Every structure is written in structure tokens, then in C-alpha cells.
Ligand SMILES: *[C@@H]1O[C@H](CO)[C@@H](O)[C@H](O)[C@H]1NC(C)=O
């Protein structure tokens with residue numbers, strides 16, 4: 001048996017709290033969440049465990065210190081996060097970008113390119129393709145590495161013609177200028 | 187002015203660890219709590235400074251004690267009346283940087299659908315044990331589930347095959363994930 | 375004929391080993407499953423662990439309710455025991471097998487009845503337990519059961535694999551062979 | 556070996572979304588379906604000698620009838636609506652590969668496989684083409700095969716002799732795809 005009490009604060013870049021929720025779970029079942037409009041715990045579960053969800057709400061509702069805590073909860077978030085929240089919203093790591101061929105898939109094309117993109121944060125990134133400097137349509141969300149960096153890739157299937165130059169165009173805030181990687185058959 | 191999520195998740199369970207606390211900014215983990223030492227442990231060195239902050243010492247204690255209460259008093263009652271929710275964990279292994287032979291790299295073992303949060307992770311090279319660099323970082327996610335990350339430093343070579351072996355410590359269920367060189371990049 | 379068929383509570387209890395099960399299925403595929411004596415509820419895929427949407431916990435009670443009814447049907451039928459049907463075993467890889475490219479072997483067992491069975495992976499005659507995954511009993515319209523076992527591996531031309539199943543419907547343990555070319 | 560098995564199935568059949576819905580509870584002793592409740596009939600009905608007592612008795616219980624008469628709405632429609640996004644709305648791409656058996660030699664008969672794996676739902680259309688003309692003849696399917704993990708797999712084999720100047724294309728169309736997938740074969 002596993003139980004949770006999940007406090008979750010939602011704040012913008014500025015540090016101004018926009019939402020706050022406090023929820024209680026048992027056996028991966030969300031039982032009751034704080035209801036500010038009601039200034040008390042209210043069961044979110046109306047099923048097999050509903051009975052319990054009520055019970056837990058009351059045991060918590062007769063608690064007094066908790067009630068003030070949660071009524072001022074939205075503040076706690078801003079107060080608790082204050083020191084680092086600016087550093088996190090300012091945190092960005094530059095993406096590395098490497099382009100090479102890869103085994104094709106779901107295509108009649110003989111060649112498949114891969115644009116690799118790693119070591120970047122935050123995860124918001126954009127990848128497009130150029131063929132001799134002109135947009136083309138590619139053949140996803142970044143994979144977190146657990147260490148506050150992300151990786152992703154884009155693909156492009158094609159037929160080689162010696163002269164043609166294919167380009168991967170990455171854009172990411174953790175980098176100052178757009179990153180371009182080229183590739184030619186030859 | 188986009189929004190960001192700060193997640194404060196206290197969880198406790200039958201067996202070890204009997205309790206745990208995970209904070210996270212967006213998806214990624216900032217701190218996990220060491221209760222025997224009674225303090226926040228930073229995921230990365232750069233978070234060290236704010237691990238000391240003790241504004242909420244009481245709030246945390248309250249939750250811990252309550253969460254624990256739920257497990258101890260409720261649960262022996264539901265024991266057998268209600269089925270203990272569990273998932274079978276999923277492991278996948280990938281390189282941190284693009285594969286280039288003879289160039290140092292790092293295998294990441296990403297465990298997902300982990301529930302309950304009770305595991306150990308072990309690496310193997312051609313089916314031979316190998317000491318993994320660093321600890322194993324468990325972390326709660328949205329949905330009341332968990333995930334974990336473990337890393338291994340290595341220098342990839344053509345013939346290599348690696349495996350990551352996860353042991354879900356309730357009933358010691360094993361879940362594996364193989365890795366091999368696939369579409370390596372030329373060096374330039 | 376129908377566009378889709380959901381089945382919410384294909385469940386069973388059997389006297390032998392006092393085992394039982396409660397599941398939800400959609401289009402012959404399983405969402406979650408409750409096992410009686412394990413007292414566990416397991417969702418086949420992560421997305422089915424929502425609990426809003428896909429709440430188990432009704433299981434056990436479902437198993438309880440259906441078990442209640444057994445003893446009487448047993449005597450009402452003049453103790454008509456269950457017959458032992460032979461299961462048919464199949465083995466094949468999940469995706470295309472390329473030498474050295476990691477993959478998963480799948481043992482598939484149909485027409486299992488009664489639902490009391492042993493299934494085991496063998497590598498070169500050696501039994502394999504580390505990293506194997508298996509389903510609970512899936513359901514068949516004819517009211518037999520299916521079962522899936524999974525074994526991740528790295529294809530090499532140096533070893534073979536057998537999926538050996540043991541059932542009362544068999545004269546002796548049969549094993550289904552697989553090896554790459 | 557003496558064993559007894561009882562089963563129950565609460566089947567729901569949907570067409571045109573939720574428009575038409577038939578709820579069918581089935582009670583099984585071993586393999587004998589001894590009684591069932593069909594929504595379209597409104598009553599329990601004994602199917603075999605074994606079910607006569609229960610059939611008559613349960614029909615006498617009005618609380619039960621009404622309860623299981625709303626099951627259409629309260630069970631089938633209820634769950635359908637809940638699962639839709641992850642069941643009916645589930646769509647997963649196939650992985651298409653084309654390869655020959657017995658390494659291809661000119662003028663000698665061979666089979667080339669179009670392996671299509673990891674896709675869902677199982678309903679799929681797979682065709683062979685030789686120099687743009689849909690080659691139907693010498694074609695062998697396995698039909699959709701369940702992997703037991705919400706994915707199907709199929710292989711469609713075409714009989715042919717590799718003569719030069721022939722290019723073979725397997726053309727796969729599927730709900731998950733916004734445009735059919737084509738894979739080609741060479742030969743030499
Ligand atoms: C941020 O969150 C608040 C509260 O959830 C919401 O009203 C607001 O629209 C959100 N802003 C953005 C940019 O998502």
C-alpha cells in the first residue's frame with residue numbers, strides 16, 4: 001500500500017503564484033483535495049473508496065493548524081520558492097547538434113538523415129529541415145535524461161544527387177543564435 | 187508569462203523506504219529528502235544552497251506523520267478487502283550523447299511505470315556485473331506513479347552489448363533492458 | 375458485426391489452489407487485472423493506471439461474489455469436474471529479428487482450460503527467469519483462456535530458445551522451439 | 556486433477572459509437588454457459604439444464620433486473636466514455652520492413668516478406684506492387700496477430716523470382732497513418 005500527500009504550486013516566471021492544490025491519495029486513488037472556496041477538504045472520489053475519502057477529510061478538517069496553513073497556502077508557495085525560482089526560470093543549457101545518416105524506416109527512400117540534439121535545457125526546442133536552403137517537410141517531445149538535460153532528434157528521408165545540400169535548423173533559448181548543421185551525399 | 191509547476195510529493199508505503207519526499211520543478215527533480223538526517227538532498231550540486239532552507243520543517247513533519255498514519259491504521263483494514271495496486275516497471279536504456287565509438291559516453295537507465303516506489307538497479311556488460319557510477323535517483327510523477335534514473339559511464343565499442351536490470355523489491359520481480367551500438371555517427 | 379466489444383468483469387474462480395481473477399477487457403485486449411491470492415491489481419499499460427477512468431478495487435469483491443456461487447453449482451451438476459483440454463503453443467519475435475539487434479520473444483498459449491498451467495523460458499536447455507514478463511489469463515469467446523509470456527534477448531546464431539508449457543491436458547511437457555537463421 | 560471453474564462475463568457490444576448498445580452478462584460453469592442476461596431480451600434466461608433454477612429465481616428479484624437493465628448506461632456507456640481516449644482513440648504506427656528469404660539469386664524462386672509490427676488497432680490493409688502494378692497473386696498473409704500488449708503484427712509474403720528490372724513495393728495503410736507507408740525492395 002502506498003499513500004500520497006501532494007502539494008503542487010503553479011507559478012509563472014515572475015514568481016507570482018497562480019494556483020495551489022493539496023491532495024491526499026491511497027493505493028493510487030485520489031481521495032480528497034483542498035477546496036479553497038469551501039475552506040475545507042472535499043472528497044474527490046465517489047466510488048468504492050468514497051466512504052474512506054469522507055473519513056479522511058473529517059480527520060483532517062478537525063485539524064486546525066492545517067486549515068490556516070492551507071488557507072495561506074498560495075502565499076507559502078511564493079515565500080518558499082522565492083530564493084531559487086529566479087535561477088530556475090533563468091536556467092538554460094545550449095543544445096549540441098550533430099547530423100548523420102541512419103537506417104531508413106517506413107519509406108521507399110534509400111537514404112535517411114538524423115538530426116541529433118542533446119545536452120539542452122529546458123526541453124522546448126524546434127527542429128526543421130532545409131534542402132539547398134529551402135524548407136521541406138520532415139518524415140515528438142524531448143526525452144529527459146534525469147540530469148536536467150534533454151535530447152531529441154528529427155529525421156529526413158531523401159534520394160541523393162551529389163549536388164544537393166541538406167541542412168538541420170535547430171532553435172533553442174539556451175543558445176544565442178540558431179544552429180545549422182549541413183549534410184551532402186558526395 | 188508562461189506557467190511552471192513546482193511539485194511537492196510526500197509518499198510512504200509498506201516496506202522500505204517507509205517514507206519519502208520528492209520536489210520537482212516542471213518534470214525534473216530538485217531534491218529528495220533524507221529523513222534519518224532530516225534534510226533536503228540536492229539532485230545536482232548547483233541546488234546545494236537551498237537544501238538548508240527550513241521554512242516548512244513543520245508542514246513536512248505533519249504530512250510525513252499523517253501519510254504514515256494512513257499506511258499503518260488504514261491498510262491492515264483494507265488488506266484483502268481491496269487489492270494492492272502495483273505496476274510492472276518498464277526499463278529502457280539509451281546513450282546520453284550520440285554514439286561514436288572509442289569516445290566516452292554514458293548509458294542512462296530510465297525506469298518508468300514504477301509502482302510501488304521500491305527498487306534497485308544493476309548494470310551488466312555481456313551478462314557480467316558492472317559497478318554503476320553514482321546512485322539511483324527515484325522521483326515521483328504526475329499520476330501518482332514514479333520513475334527512476336541510473337547512469338553508467340563507458341566508452342562504446344562495436345562488439346559491446348549492455349543490459350540494465352531492475353529488481354522491483356516487492357516479490358523481487360526482474361525487468362531488463364538491453365543496449366547495443368545502433369547507427370553510430372562518423373567522427374569529425 | 376459490432377464496432378467494438380468491451381467486457382467489464384470477465385472473472386473466474388476455481389477450486390484448485392483457490393485461485394481466481396477479475397479483469398476488464400476491450401476488444402480482446404486487457405486493461406487491468408486483479409489476482410485473488412496475490413491480492414494485487416495490475417494495469418497492462420501505464421495509461422490504464424489512472425484510477426479515474428480505470429478503477430479496479432471492485433475486484434476481489436467480484437471474485438468474492440462469484441466464488442460464493444461455486445459450491446452450489448458443483449453439487450447441482452452432480453459434481454461435474456472440469457475437463458483437461460490441450461493448449462496450443464506458439465512462439466515468435468515481437469518485431470523483425472536482425473542479428474545483434476535486441477528484441478523480444480513471445481510465447482502465446484491458446485485454449486487453456488482449466489486455467490492451471492506452467493510456462494517457462496529456456497535458453498539452451500537452461501531455464502530463464504531474470505527479466506521475463508507474463509500476463510494474467512486472457513479470455514476467449516469459447517470460454518477458454520489465453521496467456522502471454524515475454525522474454526527480451528539479443529539474437530545470436532549461437533543459441534536457441536524453447537518455451538515449455540505444462541498442462542494437465544498434456545501427456546508430458548511440450549516445448550515450442552525458436553531460433554534465427 | 557479434480558477442479559471446478561466458474562466464470563462471469565459482463566459483455567458490452569457497441570456499434571456506431573454509443574448509438575446502439577447490447578449488454579450481455581454470461582455465467583459459466585466450467586465451460587458451460589448455463590445462464591445469461593441479454594439486455595435486448597430484458598430477462599435472465601436459462602441456456603442449459605444447469606441454469607433453470609437461477610434463471611427463474613433471479614427474474615423474481617426486481618431490484619436486480621432493473622439494476623442490470625440500466626447496466627447498458629451505467630456500465631457499458633459509462634466505461635466506454637471513460638476509456639475512449641486510450642482504447643478506441645488509441646492509434647500506434649506499424650514498423651514496416653521488407654526483406655527476402657534465401658539471399659536473392661537471379662531467375663530462382665524466392666519469397667520476400669513485408670513484416671509489419673507493433674501497430675494498433677489490428678484492422679489494417681497491406682498490398683504488394685511490382686513496378687507500380689498491384690500484384691495480387693502468390694500472396695500469403697498471417698492475418699492480424701495479437702502480441703498481448705495492445706499491438707498487432709502481420710507478415711505478408713509474396714512469391715516471386717528476382718528478375719532484373721523489377722522493383723517490389725509493400726504498401727501499408729492504417730488508421731494511425733496520415734498517409735500510407737511504402738517500402739521498397741531492390742533487388743541487386
Ligand atoms: C497559468 O495558470 C493560471 C491558473 O491555472 C491560468 O489562469 C493562466 O491562464 C495560466 N497562464 C498560462 C500562460 O498558461
Ligand SMILES: *[C@@H]1O[C@H](CO)[C@@H](O)[C@H](O)[C@H]1NC(C)=O
Pocket residue numbers: 490491492540541542
Ligand atoms: C508446475 O510446476 C510445478 C513444479 O514443477 C509443479 O508443482 C506443478 O505440478 C506444475 N503444474 C502443472 C500443471 O504441471
Ligand SMILES: *[C@@H]1O[C@H](CO)[C@@H](O)[C@H](O)[C@H]1NC(C)=O
Pocket residue numbers: 571572574
Ligand atoms: C450513428 O450515430 C450518429 C450520432 O449519434 C447518428 O447521426 C446516426 O443516426 C447513427 N447512424 C446509424 C447508422 O445508426
